[PDB]
Design an enzyme around this catalytic site. Structure first.
Site, short mmCIF file in Angstrom:
data_model
loop_
_atom_site.label_atom_id
_atom_site.label_comp_id
_atom_site.label_asym_id
_atom_site.label_seq_id
_atom_site.Cartn_x
_atom_site.Cartn_y
_atom_site.Cartn_z
N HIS A 305 -9.48 -3.77 -3.56
CA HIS A 305 -9.40 -2.79 -2.57
C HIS A 305 -9.47 -1.39 -3.29
O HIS A 305 -10.13 -0.62 -2.90
CB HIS A 305 -8.13 -2.90 -1.60
CG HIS A 305 -8.09 -1.64 -0.43
ND1 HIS A 305 -8.93 -1.68 0.49
CD2 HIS A 305 -7.11 -0.83 -0.50
CE1 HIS A 305 -8.66 -1.00 1.35
NE2 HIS A 305 -7.54 -0.23 0.58
N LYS A 337 -15.02 1.28 -5.96
CA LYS A 337 -14.53 2.61 -5.31
C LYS A 337 -14.44 3.74 -6.23
O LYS A 337 -14.76 5.04 -6.11
CB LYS A 337 -13.51 2.38 -4.64
CG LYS A 337 -13.48 1.61 -3.17
CD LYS A 337 -12.59 1.68 -2.21
CE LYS A 337 -12.57 0.58 -1.09
NZ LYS A 337 -12.61 -0.49 -1.56
N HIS A 342 -14.57 5.54 -1.29
CA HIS A 342 -14.08 4.72 -0.10
C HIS A 342 -15.11 4.84 0.94
O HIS A 342 -14.90 5.82 1.61
CB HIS A 342 -12.54 4.98 0.08
CG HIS A 342 -11.96 3.90 0.91
ND1 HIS A 342 -12.57 2.87 1.49
CD2 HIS A 342 -10.62 3.81 1.42
CE1 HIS A 342 -11.82 2.12 2.00
NE2 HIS A 342 -10.60 2.67 2.21
N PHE A 401 -5.29 0.31 8.07
CA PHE A 401 -4.13 1.14 8.75
C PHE A 401 -3.65 -0.12 10.01
O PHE A 401 -4.69 -0.43 10.53
CB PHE A 401 -4.26 2.40 9.56
CG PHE A 401 -4.57 3.63 8.53
CD1 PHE A 401 -3.97 3.41 7.44
CD2 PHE A 401 -5.01 4.75 9.14
CE1 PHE A 401 -4.12 4.77 6.76
CE2 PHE A 401 -4.89 5.96 8.47
CZ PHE A 401 -4.54 5.90 7.06
C1 LIG Z 1 -8.38 2.73 5.85
O1 LIG Z 1 -7.60 1.73 6.17
C2 LIG Z 1 -7.62 3.36 4.58
C3 LIG Z 1 -6.87 2.36 3.97
N1 LIG Z 1 -5.65 2.07 3.94
O2 LIG Z 1 -7.66 1.88 2.73
C4 LIG Z 1 -8.36 3.65 6.94
O3 LIG Z 1 -7.64 4.27 7.30
C5 LIG Z 1 -9.68 3.51 7.83
C6 LIG Z 1 -9.59 3.83 9.36
C7 LIG Z 1 -11.01 4.25 9.82
C8 LIG Z 1 -11.40 5.55 9.82
C9 LIG Z 1 -12.76 6.27 10.36
C10 LIG Z 1 -12.41 7.65 10.34
C11 LIG Z 1 -11.54 7.88 11.33
C12 LIG Z 1 -11.46 9.49 11.46
#
Ligand SMILES: *[C@@](O)(CC(N)=O)C(=O)CC/C=C/C/C=C/C
Ligand SMILES: *[C@@](O)(CC(N)=O)C(=O)CC/C=C/C/C=C/C
Ligand SMILES: [Cl-]
Ligand code: NA
Ligand code: NA
Ligand code: NA
Lengths: 415, 416
Positions: A305, A337, A342, A401
């Site tokens: 990730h 990445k 990302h 998230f």
């Molecule tokens: C993604 O989970 C971040 C991480 N923890 O790697 C994340 O927040 C993506 C959420 C989707 C976002 C698209 C844009 C929104 C404004």
């Protein structure tokens, strides 16, 4: 009553990424350690603390479709349609009336048509509701990438869209893999797409301090590095053609590799903070390993990730150690990445492509920009240069998230 | 070596917030009594929109269910999902311990997620600048935050996902969770759909698309299958069910409402908003669900229809039922609860799965209200005006959405 358990192979790849407007360009740039990160041109960078992004280079939608067709698609849909047509063309799949109900689409997007929503709401506020586009609703919805792909392809089978933040692409592929495994489709066009380089996305990710404020594009995205300070936002789409094995063999399809494992868990901890020690991610990797029916020692390479954020990179390192034990320092780990940035909902799609190509080509892409080693991030990150190696099993990790954790396992195809 | 038997999947709990009530009992009792949840819009100032009616939650206060601290960082779509999921788990009498937590998952969808949050936060961006945008903006808006917040509230650590497929959202989410349990990847799944679409952009967007009824009379606005139907009436809420592996349910002495036996998913591959001619894709999705259930189409007793009160959708759904069922089409009962609840979009499939499950358990078919002018093209038995007492063995629930999505679920009376 017994479950059907079909073998599922990868027969086609299609992609748009900050590293190239096709799979070949993206893969070749990734293995040569080429960065797709530069100064922001999509939005006005003066307003935000973030000064760099990973944008598509010289992408002109009109090279792929008419201006009128493009006008009714948000960038996230444009990317998905272009990459899906690329994947089907690569698969050399002829979707006839006969096979159309057996060819499905499962493509996700983290946010869908955010740019359309911003432009249309700004029109609502300044011009009134009657000036809102009759196509605003279908253009904005995340499932419109799947909808438009199915129309463009003539695919009439299982049709869905998974939205799980940064785990989107990984879950969509895993879900399509499960559809084929249970015999509900012979072919699935799957992956993730994202066009998050917008005003609200830069404002939103700056507000929660998720974005790197490093103005230097040479060192901004540095996963596992001691000086990492947030992710660099990218855009694009990674689409793959999954196919039931006997169906692929009967039509003389080319096979890149096999999908064997899928794991999904929830941290059930916090809306944005990942679980301490990456415990949920460790559980998702364990579920995928059990799904694949292998020992953890069988994994050769992890496409991490690795977002270049403090907690995530530290927790992912901890989770790999929990799952693999003594084998953790023996395997290769790398974050693409460091080069692509990302891609959020599309990250899992692009990373599944790199994972599949790593097996087919026998080349591990590197993690670039690691200059200061972090004592907490002490695994083998394949720094700076690609590694030629015969790979049998590759693991791809994602998290998002809301505590989503998703893992996929790819295997070298053997008859 | 690996396991290979399909697990049986039962419904052990129900939770709901709808324009017919702030719980399952109130919603179900109002639905079977033909009570309308449709009235004038109060959520937004409707003077600028051609649409004048909506189906809103009545006297819903999030603070009756959680502390203010918990509710503040939740968009209405998440508040609804969390409240309905807690109600479903409480109804299931399920104790999610540390032991069973990785075997209890969440699969809840939303058609659009935090649209109100996005509108308020973008309005802050335009007038105050990007530095005034909340650090909570992104997680509050994302559709998967309903699943995210439900899993935190419950302690559910298993399979965690979110399906977003427009008006087919709730149906697909439930079908996907059913498949998770069937393959043995979870023992329990908290699943369904949630939606809070009563917003400025949603009313403007659906009016621009000409999808909304512009009928100012709340008494006749939502009239599925009626000759004078002129678009849907927007609703809001959440329908959440607890799906459980049978042996797990029996061992803990769980109450069982019924069994989920079939799931069908297809794409029209035709048009961005218009459904395929004769509802061919919907017909295929019903056929896939029937094959999944391992039954003859003649075994279906009741269809809880998509029946949104739009011209093409009601006509094409009627045609799709005739294609699938043939001579049995005029023998089965068809009803649209949207005549009372309005169209819940992403939550429609969740609420309609609850009504379908309750139809089997109670042996009562809810009616389609407001049919005053019969349409020659819509000539099936729509259970007009009044609920019908009938023993049901199999109930089919249909959904469709923009992008040509078609989704079908089949529920069965639980028999050992
Ligand atoms: C993604 O989970 C971040 C991480 N923890 O790697 C994340 O927040 C993506 C959420 C989707 C976002 C698209 C844009 C929104 C404004
Ligand atoms: C729904 O698919 C309509 C139908 N054909 O039944 C639909 O349009 C919902 C898609 C939108 C969901 C929430 C978006 C609000 C702006
Ligand atoms: Cl929220
Ligand atoms: Na998301
Ligand atoms: Na309830
Ligand atoms: Na609402």
């Amino acid at each position: 009553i017994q479950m059907t358990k079909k073998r599922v192979v990868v027969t086609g790849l299609g992609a748009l990424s900050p590293l190239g407007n096709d799979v070949d360009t993206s893969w070749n740039n990734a293995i040569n350690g080429v960065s797709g990160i530069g100064p922001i041109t999509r939005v006005d960078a003066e307003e935000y603390p973030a000064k760099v992004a990973a944008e598509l280079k010289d992408f002109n939608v009109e090279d792929y479709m008419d201006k009128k067709e493009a006008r009714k698609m948000d960038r996230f849909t444009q990317y998905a349609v272009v990459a899906a047509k690329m994947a089907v063309e690569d698969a050399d799949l002829n979707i006839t009336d006969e096979i159309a109900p057996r060819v499905g689409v499962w493509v996700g997007s983290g946010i869908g048509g955010l740019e359309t929503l911003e432009s249309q709401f700004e029109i609502f506020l300044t011009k009134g509701p009657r000036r809102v586009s009759p196509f605003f609703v279908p253009m904005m919805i995340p499932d419109m990438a799947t909808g438009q792909i199915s129309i463009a392809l003539g695919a009439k089978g299982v049709n869905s869209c998974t939205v799980t933040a940064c785990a989107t692409g990984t879950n969509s592929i895993g879900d399509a893999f499960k559809v084929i495994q249970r015999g509900d489709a012979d072919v699935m066009v799957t992956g993730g797409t994202e066009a998050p380089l917008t005003r609200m996305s830069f404002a939103g990710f700056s507000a929660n301090k998720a974005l790197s404020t490093n103005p230097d594009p040479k060192t901004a995205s540095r996963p596992f590095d001691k000086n990492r300070d947030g992710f660099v936002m990218g855009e694009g789409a990674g689409i793959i053609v999954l196919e039931e094995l006997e169906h692929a063999l009967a039509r003389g399809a080319k096979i890149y590799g096999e999908i064997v494992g899928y794991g999904s868990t929830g941290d059930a901890y916090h809306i944005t903070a990942p679980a301490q020690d990456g415990e949920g991610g460790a559980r998702a990797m364990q579920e995928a390993i059990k799904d694949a029916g292998i020992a953890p020692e069988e994994i050769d390479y992890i496409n991490a990730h690795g977002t270049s954020t403090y907690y995530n990179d530290k927790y992912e390192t901890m989770a790999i150690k929990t799952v693999f034990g003594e084998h953790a320092h023996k395997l290769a780990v790398s974050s693409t990445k460091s080069m692509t940035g990302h891609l959020l909902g599309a990250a899992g799609g692009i990373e599944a492509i790199f994972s599949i190509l790593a097996i087919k080509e026998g080349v591990i892409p590197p993690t670039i920009n690691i200059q200061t080693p972090d004592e907490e991030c002490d695994l083998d990150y394949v720094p700076d240069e690609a590694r030629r190696q015969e790979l049998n099993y590759v693991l791809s990790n994602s998290l998002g998230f809301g505590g989503h954790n998703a893992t996929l396992i790819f295997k070298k195809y053997q008859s």
